[PDB]
């Protein structure tokens, strides 16, 4: 029973950071885009205007993650029964790659869209109690920036909130295109850069203790 | 073929110094770290010490900092311990371990575990005893 506070994949140092600067770039370049700044309204003066770098830039420091189970030391929420899996034990420690398919921004938060693998979906957990009509693993994130209030799991519930925009065709067509990837928007700054080559991270399925 | 070639310890006295080496082979130069843990009998490994062979940056517990010295030659791909001022509470069976995946040292943190098998390697054993 030594249970750690959430299991998930922590992504390495280098790759961590390659994700940042790049999750960065991509605030940066959404902020400057034009058609961004065209509906910048539905993102009391302009003193700031708007500067996403500096609208999410509160972020949890350290190596990214993409949580499988939240367990708070011992079974909180059916946490011991993850951890007696066979395949959990097996996975704990060893090395993993992620997938990030896709960054995206949006009012409340902002992360990565991770395709899990079917060996990494093996971990993941079906268990919580706009994840209706899709696939397992959808609320697969990585969180990349949080704007301050924004307090919970929300960049996984975005991140599945707007993958049901695009699961009834909500995409919006290619609103415009940032470098790395192509970019759509679905509602009040529900902007997803589509990127055109996986950002492939690499990771390790262990758990957080402190 | 991963394989760390630790040495360097055995039974000294308290005040006194010992020196770890662990040459670990079968990793290629600057995206490995190599890193000792001292997992007392009937306690929990804690990381001592560990040194990215990219960074340069060295890591170490609380309780071993500036006694405990890690160093890399990184071209000879083999690092040292230079314990000093060993305790008795510094007994245990140290082991190298080399964390392959991530030249950081990120999972030699005590926040995380990190199962130096997959991509890595674990010392067996180089048994360092204080006495006195």
């Known amino acids: 029973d030594f249970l750690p506070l959430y299991f998930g994949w922590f992504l390495t140092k280098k790759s961590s950071e390659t994700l940042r600067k790049a999750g960065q770039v991509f605030l940066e370049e959404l902020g400057n885009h034009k058609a961004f700044k065209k509906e910048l309204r539905h993102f009391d003066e302009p003193k700031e205007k708007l500067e996403l770098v500096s609208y999410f830039g509160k972020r949890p420091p350290g190596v990214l993650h993409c949580t499988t189970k939240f367990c708070d030391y011992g079974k909180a929420a059916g946490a011991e029964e993850y951890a007696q899996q066979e395949v959990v034990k097996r996975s704990y420690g060893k090395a993993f790659k992620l997938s990030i398919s896709a960054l995206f921004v949006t009012p409340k938060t902002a992360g990565a869209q991770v395709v899990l693998t079917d060996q990494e979906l093996q971990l993941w957990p079906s268990d919580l109690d706009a994840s209706e009509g899709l696939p397992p693993g959808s609320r697969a994130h990585v969180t990349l920036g949080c704007a301050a209030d924004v307090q919970p799991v929300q960049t996984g519930l975005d991140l599945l909130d707007i993958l049901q925009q695009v699961k009834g065709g909500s995409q919006g067509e290619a609103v415009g295109e940032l470098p790395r990837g192509k970019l759509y928007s679905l509602g009040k700054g529900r902007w997803m850069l589509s990127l055109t080559k996986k950002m492939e991270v690499k990771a390790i399925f262990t758990g957080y203790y402190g | 073929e991963v394989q760390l070639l630790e040495s360097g310890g055995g039974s000294v006295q308290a005040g006194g110094s010992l020196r770890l080496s662990c040459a670990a082979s079968?990793?290629?130069?600057?995206?490995?770290?190599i890193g000792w843990f001292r997992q007392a009998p009937g306690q929990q490994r804690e990381a001592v010490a560990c040194?990215?062979?990219?960074?340069?940056?060295?890591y170490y517990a609380d309780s071993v900092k500036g006694r405990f010295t890690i160093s890399s030659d990184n071209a000879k791909k083999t690092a040292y311990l230079e314990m000093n001022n060993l305790k008795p509470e510094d007994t245990a069976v140290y082991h190298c371990?080399?964390?392959?995946?991530?030249?950081?040292?990120?999972?030699?943190?005590?926040?995380?575990?990190?199962?130096?098998?997959?991509?890595?390697?674990w010392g067996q054993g180089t048994q360092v005893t204080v006495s006195s």
């Open positions: 371990a080399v964390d392959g995946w991530d030249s950081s040292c990120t999972f030699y943190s005590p926040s995380y575990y990190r199962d130096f098998s997959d991509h890595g390697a």
């Open positions: 079968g990793f290629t130069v600057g995206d490995y770290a």
């Open positions: 040194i990215s062979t990219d960074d340069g940056d060295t």
